[PDB]
Amino acid sequence: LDSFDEFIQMSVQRIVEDAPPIDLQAPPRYLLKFEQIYLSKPTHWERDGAPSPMMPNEARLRNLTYSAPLYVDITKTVIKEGEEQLQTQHQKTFIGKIPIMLRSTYCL
Amino acid sequence: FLLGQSARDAERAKDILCRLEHTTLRKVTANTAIYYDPNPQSTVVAEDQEWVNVYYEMPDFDVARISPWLLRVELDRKHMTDRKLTMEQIAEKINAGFG
Amino acid sequence: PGFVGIRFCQECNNMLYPKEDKENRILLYACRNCDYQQEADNSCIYVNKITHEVDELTQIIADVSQDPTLPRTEDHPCQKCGHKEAVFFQSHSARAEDAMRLYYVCTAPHCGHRWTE
Amino acid sequence: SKTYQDIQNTIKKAKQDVIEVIEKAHNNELEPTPGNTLRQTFENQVNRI
Amino acid sequence: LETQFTCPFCNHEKSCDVKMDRARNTGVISCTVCLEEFQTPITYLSEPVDVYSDWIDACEAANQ
Amino acid sequence: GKRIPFGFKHRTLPHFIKDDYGPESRGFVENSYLAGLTPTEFFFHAMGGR
Amino acid sequence: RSCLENSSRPTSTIWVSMLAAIGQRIVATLPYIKQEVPIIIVFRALGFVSDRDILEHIIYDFEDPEMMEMVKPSLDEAFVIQEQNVALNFIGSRGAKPGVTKEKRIKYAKEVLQKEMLPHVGVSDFCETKKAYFLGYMVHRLLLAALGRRELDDRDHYGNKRLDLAGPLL
Amino acid sequence: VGLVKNLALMAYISVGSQPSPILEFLEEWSMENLEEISPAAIADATKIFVNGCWVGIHKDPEQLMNTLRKLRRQMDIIVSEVSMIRDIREREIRIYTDAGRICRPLLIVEKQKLLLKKRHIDQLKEREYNNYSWQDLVASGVVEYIDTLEEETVMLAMTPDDLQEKEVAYCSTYTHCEI
Ligand SMILES: [Zn+2]
Ligand SMILES: [Zn+2]
Ligand SMILES: [Zn+2]
């Protein structure tokens, strides 16, 4: 439990910050920065798309994966010349689902 | 297995044992040193002038052919006598090997 | 005879190599990086201690008296200071494999004295 | 109880004999038997006891 | 390590070979297509790639 | 084929003093199975059975 | 097995080894370099040029001639390289692509020595003193092992081991 | 056989901690940095390592180790899962804050007495009422987590009966006792 809690609380954020910002250029050029993770409680989305809280026994019975969605704040800055830059922050971009350890701090 | 009295007398069995077991000079050498000892008449090692002079105060070899570099090897009594080995034999083996 | 040391060039701190002054028949120590030369004080250039006879009392350090995992004795008092208690232990260096010889170190603070019986 | 007492006496004796051999090794009184390093003679003797 | 090199003059790949003349402490690199040759002092640590690097450096030194 | 090794520095276990070549230190179990082993005797007998 | 405190890269392993007149020569297996480098060349590439200054990182008490005799064959072997730029060139000639200019080979060697060799000691510029001391400690440990003054390490000893749990594994 | 293993009952595995509080304490406690020393200082000083980095040297390692232990036993700037090993013969102090070390709680012994006293048991016997916990027992400096690498330096009583006076004293300088 402690090892999983350290992974969610500290290690994911470090890995997201340690990755180099990515530059793109054709000239006009773009760079993106990943700055802050968020993890919800485990949730499942039905065939109609509505989120609801998935309990572990439902995951065992329906053969679901007990997991939570991970989000990251992304900043994009646009560069070309004259410092005519602008920044767009795409807050809470959904990045994927993380399997949750049962009875961990992030389990229901 | 041994023949004759060498099968009863432990000292003769040990003599054959020494005749079989490989002994190199390292097994019987305590230390070695290299010196700049340019005149055997006044050896830079002090402890051995008394014998060294006896070899050079006779004509069999010429100091004009002597290289000034000395190799000095110290042997130890226990390993020599455990093998009944003599320095005359060691010198004979050296001169057999290098001429 | 004891090992022969390294010695260093005064002008450039690289190590000096022995060479003879052929026309003068004296031993130099000479640099290979610069023209410095010196006369040798010891005529021994190489020593090989094949028996590897070395005194463990040089390798022992007094701080070992602080080790709580070492045995302590009152039967072998310190000659240098009369203190009753010493730690004792066997030789640690390898190749001296055979001897079970004990070495003692005084436990009195600032008496780093070490001996063998 | 007699058997247990004789067993305990034999063990106590063997432990004192090992202490004696250890003291002889520490004092360098223990002499190597032929063909064996002093460590191996000590081990042979303790295992014998 | 690689022991055959692209010629700096004629751009043919794997066209240069190194001869380590240890006894004279000199190394010769020669191109088989254009027969441009270069000689450099070599040490016992020196290897074909050090001779090639010396040749490329001498070429860039001549461009100055 | 040898007595219990010094897997700790000069020790079989941190319960013994260094350079203890004595019987208990090196794994002589002096108890019987009816008396039951002491904790160090137990662990050395597990080392043997392994 | 060097790993930076934050896992920005995987571990990189440095080996310093003593090879089996003939004498005991010490060499380094550095990462991204195709050939073992004499340790004294690695020290010169880190900018320690005189033999004394190098040995001051390897032999902390000079009144110990048995260690001096054991480093001496390596001071002999590297004596042909005496300046930092020649040492960085020597290292960069290896691993780098053969055709690149002198500046790129020097830069490649500096990049390996900063970022790939001993990253746990530092990946910054001006870390060369820290790196020289730790690489000197590695050679010193090797000398103590060769002289039998310190026991070889046990791969079974659980102090020398780590358990990767669910967190590190994920 | 032997390749698959199972944890002992009280075994804990370290989760990992950042070393910077310790480096900051050491620089405030007479450690000398490698960039500042002259090499001649190293022969009689102690090398200090933190997570394997040789960070400095120190000239009085006994008082440093006493201070470091006194910090760990107080839940101070050194967390309970930090290992601190002095090699007295090699003159090395090695400090570990990394993950994956296997460790276990031991009782502290001083002057051949347990630091655990009746007042602790009497507080633990009403744990459901007084909210006194194992964590309070560690915070009182009575229990210490010791790793395998630190056990090499520890002297363990198997029971408090080893602490008693005896007709021949096997050891008189125990540091810890098994629970
Ligand atoms: Zn010079
Ligand atoms: Zn004293
Ligand atoms: Zn060409």
UniProtKB/TrEMBL annotation, chain A:
Name of the protein in its database record: DNA-directed RNA polymerase subunit beta
Organism of provenance: Sus scrofa
Similarity comment: family membership: Belongs to the RNA polymerase beta chain family.
Cellular compartments annotated: Nucleus
Source species, domain of life: Eukaryota
Protein role: RNA-dependent RNA polymerase that catalyzes the extension of a non-coding RNA (ncRNA) at the 3'-end using the four ribonucleoside triphosphates as substrates. An internal ncRNA sequence near the 3'-end serves as a template in a single-round Pol II-mediated RNA polymerization reaction. May decrease the stability of ncRNAs that repress Pol II-mediated gene transcription. DNA-dependent RNA polymerase catalyzes the transcription of DNA into RNA using the four ribonucleoside triphosphates as substrates.
From TrEMBL, chain F:
Subcellular location: Chromosome; Cytoplasm; Nucleus
Top-rank taxon: Eukaryota
Similarity comment: family membership: Belongs to the RNA polymerase beta' chain family.
Purpose of the protein: DNA-dependent RNA polymerase catalyzes the transcription of DNA into RNA using the four ribonucleoside triphosphates as substrates. RNA-dependent RNA polymerase that catalyzes the extension of a non-coding RNA (ncRNA) at the 3'-end using the four ribonucleoside triphosphates as substrates. An internal ncRNA sequence near the 3'-end serves as a template in a single-round Pol II-mediated RNA polymerization reaction. May decrease the stability of ncRNAs that repress Pol II-mediated gene transcription.
UniProt protein name: DNA-directed RNA polymerase subunit
Organismal lineage: Eukaryota, Metazoa, Chordata, Craniata, Vertebrata
Region of the whole protein represented: 795 to 844 of 1984
Automatic annotation (TrEMBL), chain G:
Compartment annotation: Nucleus
Domain of life: Eukaryota
Domain RNA polymerase Rpb2: from-to ranges: 1-164
Family note: Belongs to the RNA polymerase beta chain family.
Biological role: RNA-dependent RNA polymerase that catalyzes the extension of a non-coding RNA (ncRNA) at the 3'-end using the four ribonucleoside triphosphates as substrates. An internal ncRNA sequence near the 3'-end serves as a template in a single-round Pol II-mediated RNA polymerization reaction. May decrease the stability of ncRNAs that repress Pol II-mediated gene transcription.
Protein's recorded name: DNA-directed RNA polymerase subunit beta
Organism: Sus scrofa (Pig)
Lineage: Eukaryota, Metazoa, Chordata, Craniata, Vertebrata
Automatic annotation (TrEMBL), chain H:
Annotated localization: Nucleus
Protein name listed in UniProt: DNA-directed RNA polymerase subunit beta
Portion of the parent chain present: 597 to 775 of 1251
Superkingdom per UniProt: Eukaryota
Domain RNA polymerase Rpb2, first and last residues per copy: 48-110, 134-179
Biological role: RNA-dependent RNA polymerase that catalyzes the extension of a non-coding RNA (ncRNA) at the 3'-end using the four ribonucleoside triphosphates as substrates. An internal ncRNA sequence near the 3'-end serves as a template in a single-round Pol II-mediated RNA polymerization reaction. May decrease the stability of ncRNAs that repress Pol II-mediated gene transcription. DNA-dependent RNA polymerase catalyzes the transcription of DNA into RNA using the four ribonucleoside triphosphates as substrates.
Family, as annotated: Belongs to the RNA polymerase beta chain family.
